[PDB]
Structures are given as structure tokens and as C-alpha cells.
Ligand binder design. Structure first.
Ligand SMILES: Nc1nc(N)nc(Nc2cc(S(=O)(=O)O)cc3cc(S(=O)(=O)O)c(/N=N/c4ccccc4S(=O)(=O)O)c(O)c23)n1
Length: 127
């Protein structure tokens, strides 16, 4: 079990970038696959990206992005600081929503929010 907390959100100007952070407590974030989601008022949480626990090469961790943000958002992992980040670029009014980070240990089902075990409270992002 791990507790997650997002930070770095808030009012942002369209065209600019924003770096969101997800900090873990109670356990090592390195033991969990971390995912990012976003939710518009009244809608469901939609999958954004995944960063795996392990590598796919000498330096890179496994990563995956929804087509909606592939190439525009970048997920990264900093286990030493028990944190995982999400660099969001060229933000626009369409990106306004509460962003969440979640965790699980499985290697499948990232798209469905119901497959994730723990969630942060979320951070509002307004552009
Ligand atoms: N090293 C390695 N090599 C290959 N081929 N694949 C992996 N996959 C993976 C390794 C690890 S890890 O812990 O070692 O880092 C985590 C993973 C987490 C998820 S997710 O469901 O949470 O998004 C995942 N989903 N994929 C998909 C989900 C939906 C559609 C397509 C994929 S795909 O397999 O990438 O193509 C993985 O495959 C993972 N890892």
C-alpha cells in the first residue's frame, strides 16, 4: 500500500508547459507502476500515461502514452525522491481538468482506472 499526492497544478496560460509531481508515502514508489489520469467536471477519469517499475533498455523505464498526449506529455520516474513526474507541454483550454496519479503493481490494464489500486487526491489544472 502507498499514499500518493499530486502537486504542481493550478492556473496556467495556454501555450505554456506545466510539470506535475506525484509523491509516494508509506512505501517505495519504485515498487509501483505509476499512471496519470485527468478528469473533466462530471466525466470519468481518462488515462494519460504509464511509467513502469522496470527498464526496457539501459536507461529508460517502460512508458506508454494515450494517443491524445503522446509527444506532448512526458512521464519520468525519480525513485530516489519517491516521486514520478509528468511534463505537460503546449497546454490549452482543453487540458483544463483535475489530474491524478495512481499506482498498481500489475503489468496490464492501465487504461481502465478501475485497475489501479491507490490514487492521489488530485490536482486541478486550469488554463
Ligand atoms: N520490458 C518490457 N517489455 C515489453 N514488451 N512490455 C513491457 N510492459 C510493461 C512493463 C511494466 S514494468 O513494471 O516492468 O515496468 C509495466 C507495464 C505496465 C503496463 S499498464 O497496463 O499499466 O499500462 C503495460 N501495458 N501495456 C499496454 C497496455 C495497453 C495496450 C498496449 C500495451 S503494450 O504492451 O505496451 O503494447 C506494460 O506493457 C508494462 N515491459
Amino acid at each position: 500500500x502507498v499514499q500518493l499526492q499530486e502537486s504542481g497544478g493550478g492556473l496556467v496560460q495556454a501555450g505554456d508547459s506545466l510539470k506535475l509531481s506525484c509523491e509516494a508515502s508509506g512505501d517505495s514508489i519504485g515498487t509501483y507502476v505509476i499512471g496519470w489520469f485527468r478528469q473533466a467536471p462530471g466525466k470519468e477519469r481518462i488515462y494519460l500515461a504509464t511509467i513502469g517499475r522496470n527498464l526496457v533498455g539501459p536507461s529508460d523505464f517502460y512508458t506508454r502514452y494515450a494517443d491524445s498526449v503522446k509527444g506532448r506529455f512526458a512521464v519520468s520516474r525519480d525513485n530516489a525522491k519517491n516521486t514520478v513526474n509528468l511534463q505537460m507541454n503546449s497546454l490549452k483550454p482543453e487540458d483544463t481538468a483535475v489530474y491524478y496519479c495512481a499506482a498498481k503493481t500489475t503489468t496490464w490494464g492501465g487504461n481502465d482506472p478501475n485497475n489501479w489500486n491507490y490514487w492521489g487526491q488530485g490536482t486541478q489544472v486550469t488554463v
